[PDB]
Ligand binder design. Structure first.
Ligand SMILES: COc1ccc(C[C@H](N)C(=O)N[C@H]2[C@@H](O)[C@H](n3cnc4c(N(C)C)ncnc43)O[C@@H]2CO)cc1
Ligand SMILES: COc1ccc(C[C@H](N)C(=O)N[C@H]2[C@@H](O)[C@H](n3cnc4c(N(C)C)ncnc43)O[C@@H]2CO)cc1
Ligand code: NA
Ligand SMILES: [Zn+2]
Length: 866
């Protein structure tokens, strides 16, 4: 369609204060009756323009009068000649069973459910579908009681009835005014897990978790995580739940992960269901994080919502920041930080160099569903974490309090939030606001100097952001740049200047500046950008010895990991260059030694050891290069794995056996040891073949949990061990009837290093457990192939591109949101070599030419070809 621009925001000409919905539900034809109380604020001659998509209009009344002064345009009902106050009644029809895009009211198996964020409510009825219009909802649902015994919407059940012909109804009322993107409705038959939580101040909240019949056994962990979320929001932010009931529904057909609809969250069943033998540690920790996320939105999203969709990061940056803090408080703070930083440097940095690059507050949008992004979410959270770094926790909490005090019950902007932090804290964030408007990854370059005469250490720090496809003009940011200086014994040198302490978070606000530290009694080794204090690329000329020194002595665990990443980065680059010339891996002995030391150090948290022994993904590796050679990166990852496996064989085996655990528990210390153990297993799989096959075949068959079974099956696929096909067949035979469990298997198929992997993936389009109608299946087979198997996707013959093209040709008509996610690997063509660009550009040109090209794909394809 048309592009929308943030600078065109204007307050609406009309407001709706209250809406009274009735749904006469049927999967083929639902009848919606919508009675809205409305108020004109604009001019007497400005019509009311209601958004609407794929609605059949049955009638329109204004204060009970059949209205003649209206028309239908593309995506709208435009109503003229209105009074200043009136009751709008719309009756319209929709078809949930036809809805394959999973936006609006649609069917997930036998259940009916909604997804309204961002602009989905307009697929349900004609409305002011924009988030600065907030209204009190009342929702009456009528349905067949055999098919739809449970009828749910936001808030409290206020009314109930039985009708003739085996139909019944229920009515719901939510007292908190809300934007329509927070409306939900669910109808179906469910098992329900019921529990309670008592808030800090004494309010008893009924908790209800609705899952498909037969899954009540995969529900307790989710329930436990919801309670943990409620408690933690109380402890850390002082925020209590505000209603009497908290509902969560797990559905199998869902485009997002989870939707924070007020009092009635709707979740991808992936981020709900877990059993010891179906779900890994990471699934558990994911379920905790996503449950937390949806819950944290209750304040950062719902009680304070977004003025317009360009303000998405107001709620997402802040709510991701909150789910990261929650995971970090409850588990390992370092491991959380490490994985969030992996995602930043490996996926988000790629997005900010791509044709889809955008600031965390976008300036232009064609299809808003395209902006539910790594940038908006993860970079968003980094921006919030930077405010925290600048203010400290006490001031940050005061800013949170001021934000709620001012904006509770209304829609706000990114700028309102920054303003609350600034006013509450008395820290100036004027310059800081430039993080919201500027796209791309800044590059921070650092040079140092030690003067022994004066005992001064000088840092010369410079920054630039390169131009991005969306912005030609770039300016310097306010970069909180955290340092520590270590002496020759590993002790922290105190930071000072002119005889007074200096804060260790430097305000790097200029294109270039110099910081001078005094009483630096010994030439330091620095930890730069501590805890990834700003989302930037660091350019510093490290020696290997500086890096291994940091691995042994750095105070913060994250710095030890990060030092190690910098150590490996030099050698990854070296060996990618070697690969291109036909040369085998080269690696200095002392690099191997550094990793041996981590394996055998008995004092190191095993959580941390595991992360140091987890090599950068092919995605983190790709960001070290201007032009990406995806085949060299994959082969080098495998070769570096083989070489460390050979060098460290005896140490790896010892640590593998030492961390054996007979009991399975979902507890942070046990997860650490298991994670280290399975990191050792993965190297061992790439070692001596027989021993590998034995270890892996055995762990798979003996495992009492899916973490251990999958780590092994995954190693078997990756090293191409002899046991592979047999373990993979066993897994399929046992688990084919279970889609979430099979997703792991499809990911393994899709990411296999085998030579015929595409041929297998095509074949798996026919597999019993695959369906093009399910986003989860699609993402696990097709999406994993294109995103996570770059060597096969980028096969020289272009076969990966054409496969994706076929898939997208289907998905563009079926589910454009999923299509748009799957296209993302093809729009990175400018990172690749000429011959690859040529073939990727042709693929995009083929897709550009589809009849009924979705706006979702259109936005991306044209940016990519520009
Ligand atoms: C939706 O719910 C979740 C669930 C879990 C997480 C945390 C987890 N480390 C994690 O999955 N983290 C990551 C990623 O694994 C994955 N991801 C997001 N975008 C891509 C991508 N591009 C082609 C865009 N390729 C491969 N994987 C991608 O989604 C997460 C974004 O942080 C985040 C969000
Ligand atoms: C083949 O290529 C593919 C295939 C699939 C994807 C989807 C990817 N998991 C993904 O980006 N998915 C996500 C993320 O980028 C972000 N997001 C959504 N929810 C969260 C979340 N909490 C729920 C914890 N935390 C962090 N980020 C989140 O919004 C997106 C849409 O819901 C991407 C690329
Ligand atoms: Na009017
Ligand atoms: Zn969210």
């Amino acid at each position: 369609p048309q592009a929308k621009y943030r600078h065109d925001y204007r307050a609406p000409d009309y407001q709706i204060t209250d809406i009274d919905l009735t749904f006469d539900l049927d999967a083929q034809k639902t009848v919606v009756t919508a009675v809205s109380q409305a108020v004109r604020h604009g001019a007497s001659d400005a019509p009311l323009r209601l958004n609407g998509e794929d609605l059949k209009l049955v009638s329109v009344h204004i204060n009970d009068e059949p209205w003649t002064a209206w028309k239908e345009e593309e995506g709208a009902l435009v109503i003229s000649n209105l009074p200043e106050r009136f009751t709008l009644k719309i009756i319209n029809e929709i078809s949930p069973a036809a809805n394959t895009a999973l936006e609006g009211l649609y069917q997930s198996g036998d259940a009916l459910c909604t997804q309204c964020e961002a602009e989905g409510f307009r697929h349900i009825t004609y409305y002011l579908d924009r988030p600065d219009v907030l209204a009190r909802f009342t929702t009456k649902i009528i349905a067949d009681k055999i098919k739809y015994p449970f009828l749910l919407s936001n808030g409290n059940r206020v009314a109930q009835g039985e009708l003739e012909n085996g139909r019944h109804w229920v009515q719901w009322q939510d007292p908190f005014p809300k934007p329509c993107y927070l409306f939900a409705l669910v109808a179906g038959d469910f098992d329900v897990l019921r529990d309670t939580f008592t808030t800090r101040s004494g309010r008893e909240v009924a908790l209800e978790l609705y899952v498909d019949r037969g899954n009540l056994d995969r529900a307790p962990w989710a329930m436990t995580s919801l309670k943990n979320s409620m408690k933690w929001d109380e402890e850390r932010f002082g925020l209590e739940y505000d209603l009497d009931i908290y509902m969560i529904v797990a559905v199998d057909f869902f485009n997002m992960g989870a939707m924070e609809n007020k009092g009635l969250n709707i979740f991808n069943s992936k981020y709900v269901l877990a059993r010891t033998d179906t779900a890994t540690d990471k699934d558990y920790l994911d379920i905790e994080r996503v449950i937390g996320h949806a819950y944290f939105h209750n304040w950062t999203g719902n009680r304070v919502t977004c003025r317009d969709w360009f303000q998405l990061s107001l709620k997402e940056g802040l709510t991701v920041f909150r789910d990261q803090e929650f995971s970090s408080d409850l588990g390992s703070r370092a491991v959380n930080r490490i994985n969030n930083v992996r995602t930043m440097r490996g996926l988000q940095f790629a997005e900010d160099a791509s044709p889809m690059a955008h600031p965390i507050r976008p300036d232009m949008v064609i299809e808003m569903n395209n902006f539910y992004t790594l940038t908006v979410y993860e970079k968003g959270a980094e921006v919030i974490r930077m405010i925290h770094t600048l203010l400290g926790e006490e001031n940050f909490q005061k800013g949170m309090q001021l934000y709620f005090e001012r904006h509770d019950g209304s829609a706000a902007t990114c700028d309102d939030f920054v303003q609350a932090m600034e006013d509450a804290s008395n820290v100036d964030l004027s310059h800081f606001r430039r993080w919201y408007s500027q796209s791309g990854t800044p590059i921070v370059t650092v040079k140092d100097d030690y003067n022994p005469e004066t005992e001064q250490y000088t840092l010369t720090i410079s920054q630039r952001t390169p131009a991005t496809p969306d912005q030609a003009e770039k300016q310097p940011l306010h970069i909180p740049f955290a340092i520590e200086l270590y002496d020759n014994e590993g002790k922290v040198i105190p930071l000072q200047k002119g005889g007074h302490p200096v804060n260790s978070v430097l305000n790097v606000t200029q294109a270039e500046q110099t910081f001078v530290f005094d009483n630096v009694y010994f030439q330091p080794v620095p930890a730069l950008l501590c805890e990834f204090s700003a989302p930037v690329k660091l350019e510093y000329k490290w020696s290997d010895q500086q890096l291994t020194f940091l691995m042994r002595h750095a105070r913060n665990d994250f710095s030890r990991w990060d030092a190690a990443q910098s150590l490996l980065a030099t050698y990854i680059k070296l060996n990618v260059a070697r690969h291109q010339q036909g040369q085998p891996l080269s690696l200095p002995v002392h690099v191997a030694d550094a990793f041996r030391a981590v394996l055998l150090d008995e004092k190191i948290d095993p959580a941390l050891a595991a992360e140091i022994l987890t090599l950068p993904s092919v995605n983190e590796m790709a960001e070290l290069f201007d032009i990406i050679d995806p085949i060299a990166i994959a082969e080098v990852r495998e070769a570096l794995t083989r070489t460390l496996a050979t060098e460290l064989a005896d140490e790896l085996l010892a640590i593998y056996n030492a961390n054996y655990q007979s009991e399975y528990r979902v507890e942070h210390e046990d997860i650490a040891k298991r994670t280290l153990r399975n990191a050792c297993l993965r190297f061992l799989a790439f070692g001596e073949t027989h021993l590998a096959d034995v270890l892996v075949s055995k762990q798979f068959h003996e495992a009492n949990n899916m973490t251990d079974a999958l780590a092994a099956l995954s190693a078997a696929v990756a090293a191409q061990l002899p046991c592979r096909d047999a373990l993979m067949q066993e897994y399929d035979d046992k688990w084919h009837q279970n889609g979430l469990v099979m997703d792991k298997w499809f990911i393994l198929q899709a990411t296999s290093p085998a030579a015929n992997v595409l041929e297998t993936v095509r074949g798996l389009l026919q597999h019993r457990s695959f369906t093009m109608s399910n986003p989860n299946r699609i993402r696990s087979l097709i999406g994993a192939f294109a995103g996570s198997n770059p060597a096969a996707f980028h096969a020289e013959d272009g076969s990966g591109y054409l496969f994706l093209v076929e898939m997208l040709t289907d998905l563009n008509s079926r589910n454009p949101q999923v299509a748009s996610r799957l296209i993302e690997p093809l729009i990175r063509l400018k990172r690749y070599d000429a011959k690859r660009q040529e073939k990727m550009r042709a693929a995009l040109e083929q897709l550009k030419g589809l009849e009924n090209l979705s706006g979702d794909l259109y936005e991306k394809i044209t940016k990519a070809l520009a």
